[PDB]
Amino acid sequence: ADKEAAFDDAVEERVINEEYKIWKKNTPFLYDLVMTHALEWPSLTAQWLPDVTRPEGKDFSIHRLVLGTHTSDEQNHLVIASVQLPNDKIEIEIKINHEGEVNRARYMPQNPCIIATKTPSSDVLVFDYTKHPSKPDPSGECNPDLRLRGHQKEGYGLSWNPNLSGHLLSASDDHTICLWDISAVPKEGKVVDAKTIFTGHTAVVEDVSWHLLHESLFGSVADDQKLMIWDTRSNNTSKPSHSVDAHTAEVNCLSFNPYSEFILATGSADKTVALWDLRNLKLKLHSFESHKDEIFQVQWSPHNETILASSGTDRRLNVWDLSKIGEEQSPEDAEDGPPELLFIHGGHTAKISDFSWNPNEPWVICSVSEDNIMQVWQMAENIYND
Amino acid sequence: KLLSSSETKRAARRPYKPIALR
């Protein structure tokens, strides 16, 4: 019957708890910081806000995170939490009523009080948290400062242009990518319509990201197994500038390298992260392997150009260092993984839904999983410092 | 040097194995 499945899961859960016990006992040696915090509801999203505040005389600083909720069924919110970090406790500070679970939430670089969210609906909402109360209304009525239309279904991908203030890209399960320019604010239009719609993909579009230097370029990835590079200056929106057979399965994420304008990374259901050179996309630079299941998020370090991290379904977050590619290993070491695999974070015991590198404290990461856990952590300095 | 950086780097890639304190 179906019984074999619930029993096989429970055996798996038992192995998972054993491994967790071992990891926990190992943390004093692997980490200069590990904070575990159980959220009320799981968050599907996490992103550090750009601001830090460092009180005079004090031995910590205060940082903040955009999170969201994912209730079995109860009122859903968009969240801003604060985090106190030791210097050289986690508290919910703002809750905003939200129509369904927050699939993803991202702040506008040019104005961090502005936050876009993706929903179970086709609508892409926009909120400005300074225009809302800290304490949400007990009604649970979601009043968004904007409401963007263009999609027929939900998705995950969401990306603000860091060079053109208010240009928002979005990916959907409808196979399309929509662009909005919310800079064209009306007095109170309170609903916008999509400036452009890109239709090159032939399946669910999992992610989209603006290039960080060139305001006209963006990349998208999809369940058609393709990476596509789009120039907003071309007039053809049904055919990208470049289209690559990126992976042997669904492509769930991409990230542009913040120091190298030609280098990007994609992560896949094929259990690999691929490295790309935009000047010759016909040829993959490298394939990072070690993950045991589908990869859903990939993020370059904001401080270290050769450092990349990836997470997914296998409950692991891996950190990679490109500069170790091709180095020779003993056979004992090669059993553990390729030489560019620098760290495996084993702190989680369920699927990792999102993570974010702290932009103010080098090496600090926040990762969130499906079992409500949020971890903020930093690997031991001798791991990377040599 | 109960624990070397080298054994720490190796442990970084084996998080589910207990760290050997020799």
Numbering used by the authors:
A (entry chain A): 2 to 89, 114 to 411
B (entry chain B): 670 to 691
Question: Would you copy out the relevant sentences from the publication that reported this structure?
Answer:
We, therefore crystallized two further RbAp48-MTA1 complexes, where the N terminus of each MTA1 peptide was defined by the structurally resolved region in our initial complex (residue 670). We extended the C terminus of each MTA peptide (either to residue 695 or 711) to explore the extent of the structured segment and collected diffraction data to 2.15 Å and 2.50 Å resolution, respectively. Two molecules of RbAp48 and two molecules of MTA1 were found in the asymmetric unit of crystals formed from the complexes of RbAp48 and MTA1-(656–686 and 670–711), whereas one molecule of each polypeptide was observed in the asymmetric unit of RbAp48-MTA1-(670–695). Rcryst and Rfree for each of the final refined models were, respectively, 18.2% and 22.5% for RbAp48-MTA1-(656–686), 18.9% and 23.1% for RbAp48-MTA1-(670–695), and 20.6% and 25.9% for RbAp48-MTA1-(670–711). In all cases the data fitted well to a simple 1:1 binding isotherm, and dissociation constants from representative measurements were 2.3 ± 0.3, 0.05 ± 0.007, and 0.24 ± 0.16 μm for MTA1-(656–686), MTA1-(670–695), and MTA1-(670–711), respectively (standard errors from single curve fits are given). The structures provide a rationale for the higher affinity observed for the MTA1-(670–695) and MTA1-(670–711) peptides as compared with MTA1-(656–686). Residues Ile-688 and Leu-690 form a hydrophobic cluster with Leu-672. This cluster, which cannot form in the MTA1-(656–686) peptide, interacts with the aromatic side chain of Phe-30 in RbAp48. Our crystal structures suggest why the affinities of the longer MTA1 peptides for RbAp48 are substantially higher than those of histone H4 peptides for RbAp46 (KD of 0.05 μm for MTA1-(670–695) and 0.2 μm for MTA1-(670–711) versus 1 μm for H4-(1–48)). A tyrosine at position 685 in MTA1 is positioned in a narrow groove on the surface of RbAp48, forming van der Waals contacts with residues that line the groove, but this residue is replaced with a glycine in histone H4.
